[PDB]
Amino acid sequence: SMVVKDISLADWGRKELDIAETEMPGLMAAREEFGKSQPLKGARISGSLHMTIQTAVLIETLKVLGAEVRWASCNIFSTQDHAAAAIAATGTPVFAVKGETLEEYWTYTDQIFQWPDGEPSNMILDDGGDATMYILIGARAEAGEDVLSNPQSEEEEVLFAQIKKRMAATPGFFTKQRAAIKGVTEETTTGVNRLYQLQKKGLLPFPAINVNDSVTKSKFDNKYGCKESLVDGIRRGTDVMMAGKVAVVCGYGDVGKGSAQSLAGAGARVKVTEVDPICALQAAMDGFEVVTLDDAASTADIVVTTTGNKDVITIDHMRKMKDMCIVGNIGHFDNEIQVAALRNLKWTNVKPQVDLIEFPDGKRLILLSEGRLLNLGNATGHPSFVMSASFTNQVLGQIELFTRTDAYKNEVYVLPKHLDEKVARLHLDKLGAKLTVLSEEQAAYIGVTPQGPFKSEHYRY
Amino acid sequence: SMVVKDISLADWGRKELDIAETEMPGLMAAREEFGKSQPLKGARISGSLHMTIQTAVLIETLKVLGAEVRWASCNIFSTQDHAAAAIAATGTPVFAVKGETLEEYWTYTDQIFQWPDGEPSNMILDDGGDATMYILIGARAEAGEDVLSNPQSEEEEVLFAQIKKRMAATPGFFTKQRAAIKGVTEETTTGVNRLYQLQKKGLLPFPAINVNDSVTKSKFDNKYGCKESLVDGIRRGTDVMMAGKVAVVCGYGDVGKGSAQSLAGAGARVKVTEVDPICALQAAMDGFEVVTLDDAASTADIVVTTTGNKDVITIDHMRKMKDMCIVGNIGHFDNEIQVAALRNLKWTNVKPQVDLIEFPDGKRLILLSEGRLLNLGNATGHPSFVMSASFTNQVLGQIELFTRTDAYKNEVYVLPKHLDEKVARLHLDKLGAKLTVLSEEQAAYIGVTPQGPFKSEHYRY
Amino acid sequence: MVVKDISLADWGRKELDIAETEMPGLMAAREEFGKSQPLKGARISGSLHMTIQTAVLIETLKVLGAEVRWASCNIFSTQDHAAAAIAATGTPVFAVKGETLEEYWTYTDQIFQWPDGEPSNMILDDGGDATMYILIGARAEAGEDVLSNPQSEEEEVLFAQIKKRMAATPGFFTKQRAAIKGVTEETTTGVNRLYQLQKKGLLPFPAINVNDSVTKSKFDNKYGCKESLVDGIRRGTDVMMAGKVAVVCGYGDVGKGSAQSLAGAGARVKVTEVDPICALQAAMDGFEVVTLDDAASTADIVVTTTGNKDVITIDHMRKMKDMCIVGNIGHFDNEIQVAALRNLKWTNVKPQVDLIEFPDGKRLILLSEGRLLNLGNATGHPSFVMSASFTNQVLGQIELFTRTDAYKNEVYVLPKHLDEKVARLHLDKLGAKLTVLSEEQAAYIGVTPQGPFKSEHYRY
Amino acid sequence: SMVVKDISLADWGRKELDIAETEMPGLMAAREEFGKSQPLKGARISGSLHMTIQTAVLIETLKVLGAEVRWASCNIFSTQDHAAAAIAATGTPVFAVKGETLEEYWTYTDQIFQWPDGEPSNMILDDGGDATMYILIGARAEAGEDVLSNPQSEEEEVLFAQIKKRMAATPGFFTKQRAAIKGVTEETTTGVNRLYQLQKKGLLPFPAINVNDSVTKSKFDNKYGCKESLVDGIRRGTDVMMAGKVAVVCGYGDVGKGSAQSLAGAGARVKVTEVDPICALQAAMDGFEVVTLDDAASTADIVVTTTGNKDVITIDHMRKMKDMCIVGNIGHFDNEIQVAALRNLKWTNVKPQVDLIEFPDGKRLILLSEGRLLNLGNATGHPSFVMSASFTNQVLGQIELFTRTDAYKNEVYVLPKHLDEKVARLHLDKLGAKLTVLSEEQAAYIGVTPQGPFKSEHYRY
Ligand SMILES: NC(=O)c1ccc[n+]([C@@H]2O[C@H](COP(=O)([O-])OP(=O)(O)OC[C@H]3O[C@@H](n4cnc5c(N)ncnc54)[C@H](O)[C@@H]3O)[C@@H](O)[C@H]2O)c1
Ligand SMILES: NC(=O)c1ccc[n+]([C@@H]2O[C@H](COP(=O)([O-])OP(=O)(O)OC[C@H]3O[C@@H](n4cnc5c(N)ncnc54)[C@H](O)[C@@H]3O)[C@@H](O)[C@H]2O)c1
Ligand SMILES: NC(=O)c1ccc[n+]([C@@H]2O[C@H](COP(=O)([O-])OP(=O)(O)OC[C@H]3O[C@@H](n4cnc5c(N)ncnc54)[C@H](O)[C@@H]3O)[C@@H](O)[C@H]2O)c1
Ligand SMILES: NC(=O)c1ccc[n+]([C@@H]2O[C@H](COP(=O)([O-])OP(=O)(O)OC[C@H]3O[C@@H](n4cnc5c(N)ncnc54)[C@H](O)[C@@H]3O)[C@@H](O)[C@H]2O)c1
Ligand SMILES: Nc1ncnc2c1ncn2[C@@H]1O[C@H](CO)[C@@H](O)[C@H]1O
Ligand SMILES: [K+]
């Protein structure tokens, strides 16, 4: 009916939720505005998104708006057990344990679609595309397409076996559920990229709102969020001194940028790697030495990958690294580091999400969260405030695709700027940030209304 | 023939160009790449752009590409005399003096179009849109439209007089010149906004390249440039101690962002104003107190405007200010501050571009560059390296519109991403910034090619 | 031995393996003095936060020949896995995270109770509690009225512990006092206490002020707090730093580190001070300098760093806004008027995190019940910076044990050449390459190429 | 009665003062607090200190507190002629002309001891110790010691010639002047050095206050002052871009620490060299790479020296540097850089205080101020606020010695901490910094009084 680590943690979860709500004015404002109206009454939402305290506040907001939901995490180490307990105790089905196996993970992703009345979900709230991919690959398998062979990875084999179990247990499930989905809201860059791949190949059968690319998501969550929680995760994992140390940051997109500020602000000296010349130029301009990991690996104290790509930190890199160098990843998936390549070496667990890996020559590495997003694995992810900006976009995205589904075609959308502006505006008071108002004449003079939007569609901020 | 302050400054100018070239790899790469093939042979370029050492390197670069140019500055205080002189000494006609009057400014603007063979220019390279407007408003006047009446500013009246003057001396001039322009490239936000007004009204009769919105322009020039050059201007103008002082930055776009960094990085404590809630939330997140000038004026030590709007610092604000508060503008035009409203009071010149204005109660203000761009007025504007990234776009813009004019409609375009990435790429070596190369598998994995472009069309960086 | 759970020892040992690679000072001292055993015969009573870092120190003192008995100097600052690892070696330790006041003082007394019945001969102290216990006890034994009118609950427990000891083994305090060759004192608040003793003629043995080594006060107190303040506030509250206003009370070494901690994490810092010079430094460093009276009502975070008392009062706490976070990183829990909060409704959120509700409904988040939140809510300063602090401790123990007769009953600091050696020992770890003076250069500036490089009272 | 370059420039001097005063709250507040009580009535002060506008404000402050004064520069080139003029217009004897002869210099030093009533000085206010040493050496000569033979330098022969001139002219002048000095204050490290040697050899015949080691003066000059004026100097000189650049700072004392902050704050990436392991460890902990100039020279873009040593940047380093490396000294005071060693290479002057030096292989260097102090050479020295903190120390020292002469032995003393604190208080209000007051209970608790001093004699702050 629910799967959590320990239901007795509910009370603790609840207390922290009391606190988080005072930090999340966006979601609370959505409860005020849409509670009575109940725009999501009739919504049947399967959520796949880090089961944190922040996600719990979102979940309860969705419910206040009329939705029924079933939830699971989008990572095996990112759950906050007391958050999961507190949500479970309300009766909302949740399947999320910090430290679950891969098999369990896919079992749980499946569970979010298994409603008691035997009818399907009609909405997906996704982070990384795992729930979306599960349905769409499932359905194609059910249509006879050969899509469950030649598994590239362990994780992929486990995903396949889970699709096979579901096909056998309830034939027609995927087909039926693919058709039942009114729309999906996608939270993160890696997820959005998967959406665009689908659209480009004509494999997206319903509309998606790209939540990541709201300005109040990508330029806040991905950047400030990582600034807050990257060093947090490293610190809890290792308790290492930042001052005096060299940290190499692989990638200089939004996450990479935030990550560099996280480390720099703590006193580490930051070096950056990149493949995009524009982002690399930014990094240099921002004061950072721009290197390759091939050149910088053997003298780094800390190495962090932020790319969304793969094989960024390889076994060759890790052999060069000096004793006790700290290795971690804060991009969505664990393949940015070649962890699988380290499995034939001697591992000593230090504590949860902290492992000492020993090379033939006696050199040791400290690996965080087994190569999974270390901010959520080693700590608690992004603070409540920033998550409020992200999740308010999520709420608006859900309202759009559920209540105005016919306005949308089978493609990836972003929310309109006036909504983006609304989201930021909701978070200003909380910080005691006083906004100036344009005179009618000033607005005229620069080509806008006093009410906004204030920028052209593709302004970059 | 030419008009500069003092032709004997040429040697100094020349020595600073030898140095400046080592700081502008973008422009020097273009000379190597397009020198022999001479894509601008037959170009007759009228340039209206701050006549600085940086612009001088651009001018020589355009000549090396085959172009013949005639130049003027786009601001009465922004010239560097020794740069103007070095350019005049090569025989290129240049009409720019630091501290020219309004009348002189328009006389020079007109001169850039007066070729010795009596034939019109065929290209414009513009910053602010003054040279473009002149031709266009002049042409309309010639067609009998009533565009020369009810002038709002002293500046508007002198522009009208100059247009009439030219109409009488050489009838048909504006119309024959309008028709002869193959294209215009526009440098800055305020100019680009003017262009969009035109296009919108159907009043753009040729293609325009919006250089401002190149990523390697807006996110570098407008941000990092002002970071370098705002306090530079304030220090040269006032020698005030920064640590311990409170500065108010009005606006938090690309310029306000850089301006804030400029002051903070020098030790001042920075408060920010904004009308855009997303930009305000960025400023609060960046650790700045977000206030209204109404509330903050009376205790500020420094007040700077960066909006490109008008009437941002009013007479009411300046009244509230404390004795010796420094006031400046770094947006494109002198109407952001209500300087006209100060003409009423007792001025005392302190030195070039620094005035002490005394209110009735005896309260004094220090006004910088008479409320015009203080970075260029009180110092020398942005350093060479950043102007190289900015100006390398200009050169590519000219090459496009001059060699491929038939591919463009009467609209505002931006350069393609691959060119933006090229520009960045040409600046990496100068900084010892070494780029990583995607493996074939890696590029496939994220949906790009190893040669780029690496980001979707509207990626915000 | 008393620890939370001896089964944590393996975990503690793994983190010691790691900590050692971060603490080259201590490991160097093992190399230099291990065979020579300068502390052979030393019987050291240690009262210092029983963290992983302190565990590396303890093992270093043992490599040098010492026998030790250890207790923490704060009820919340122990890391149970460190305590366990140390206990597993056979070294007597008495330290549990979350001990009661009564337990604390039982453990402080335990560090002086050796199996053979003979007294300790050295004290390694942090905050002065172990030193005060012996000194106040010995005066009570000599008949002085020093155990009356207790001014706090904690003071009451101390008096009862002293009375309990005098009853069990009469004469213990007098004999232990006389048996102490010397004490080394780690922290500002402890040193302050020593100076008060010396001024009154109540210091009966030499003390090394380890806090005022440049490689301690200008590193530990500053960089240490830079690293660990925000750490403790994040683990306790997971609050967003960006966009928030934090008021730091005090701008000495710790207050300076603390401001950097919060600012570098995104918070906007305002600072209070009583010392005009320190205030001017704050303003020069870019911080708004305010009174808490004025700033209290709009702050999001308020942190005290003074070593003083009654800095954050009931009146301030009344003015604060709902969900304001309140903590202290000075040595003692009286900087904040915690006791004045005791009749209000408290709800525990989790260890060292409490929600306190006022009559009007306004709630505050108090960290570690007003005790050092870096050690309370996280794990204190990182190993590297503590290696600097603890290498000074080792050198100070060696001094007062091996050369006791060269010191009078006063507070001393280590000579500059030892201070420079400590810094030197930590350079390689960071890949910091030092330049060497030419003979002529040295002469030109009035030094030798070997150092010391600065005058006695150079401020750095 | 006065020697200045042009009494005509006096009105302009005054206009400069009006501005500078508003930036020197310390000295001004001194005037409001002590003006009425006239604690320097009866003072007859002989001053020797760079005759700048800042020093003019100091001077007038001394007169406001009742002091009668005669003044000269402590340097032949430091005099700002309109300051002198403004001061001589007061009726105050000033003997200072920018560019004065060495002979004339000593003649002006003598003139500050020649009062028209024929009686002697009773106080010396000194920077560098030339005015103190002149009286003391002269008096040793008049007591018959052989001290005017064996001049080490031709600059010393000017000294000795000048004492014999005065000895011959008015027998006993020196003996009687030495006996009349109540006390002297000293501003600089070199001046203190000389005095402390007098003291060690029983040659110090009166109390001296060492002001250089006040916290509010050593920190304000050395660190905050150089923080404000380093990057400023380098910009005015080269207009180079800081962002993206590597700057090597030689030495990490107070001047080095400020210099590092100046550069990092402007966007440069700072490396640091040191011989002192404590300072080096400070640098690494402040997040700077700690290197030897030997290793870092070939890739530096800016190298600045701050050591106060000699032969810091040698010809061997300069040969290794890349083309267009900028090289400067902010220490003291020439000879940190081996400039002379470069005199055979091709020098091309770019403008005042900026020289291009070319090596045999075409490698050029940009050298600032010929390797002398660049903050004075290319900028305008330290800001007024900075100098206000430092000159307020002189004042308080003067009051202290003049009014409590009896409390002092003939030794060098540092300024009492309560006065150091007083200096700070005097600047707090201008900054808007509000001081908290200890309760009587809090004060006893920590072992001080509510009035301070608040720290022990050797607290390092
Ligand atoms: N942990 C979190 O809380 C969190 C939050 C947001 C996003 N993410 C994840 O982080 C990843 C990155 O997100 P983003 O918003 O920064 O995307 P982004 O595209 O803005 O930036 C990724 C950057 O990595 C660079 N890159 C790619 N391959 C590289 C390589 N081999 N070496 C060096 N650089 C390389 C790209 O040029 C790009 O600039 C995604 O997986 C995203 O889903 C995680
Ligand atoms: N001097 C220079 O070196 C330089 C360089 C680049 C651009 N500019 C000029 O600076 C101006 C700003 O350009 P930008 O690139 O920053 O454009 P931008 O649109 O990114 O920034 C303008 C910002 O000002 C804000 N704003 C508008 N009116 C306001 C008001 N009344 N009060 C407070 N904030 C207000 C807007 O919300 C906007 O975010 C333009 O005129 C541009 O041409 C100057
Ligand atoms: N938590 C830790 O890991 C850690 C580390 C080192 C020191 N400490 C403790 O921190 C405390 C401070 O030590 P420090 O080394 O910074 O001492 P310090 O003397 O250098 O700093 C204390 C400052 O507080 C100021 N102050 C005093 N009362 C004040 C008041 N009522 N309001 C505002 N400011 C006031 C003083 O002027 C002084 O500048 C001591 O208790 C010390 O033992 C803790
Ligand atoms: N330009 C100015 O406005 C200004 C102002 C004050 C002082 N100064 C001058 O600056 C110099 C330094 O002053 P300070 O207050 O920093 O004194 P300081 O003694 O505090 O700093 C000197 C530092 O230089 C280091 N050093 C010495 N030789 C070195 C070498 N070969 N390589 C690397 N580091 C070396 C020393 O270890 C010491 O830490 C003095 O000569 C002083 O007169 C200049
Ligand atoms: N504490 C958190 N709770 C929920 N989601 C988070 C948290 N921190 C980061 N994320 C989200 O996780 C995604 C990374 O997979 C990002 O898109 C981000 O929005
Ligand atoms: K969190």
Ligand SMILES: [K+]
């Ligand atoms: K420039």
Ligand SMILES: [K+]
């Ligand atoms: K620790």
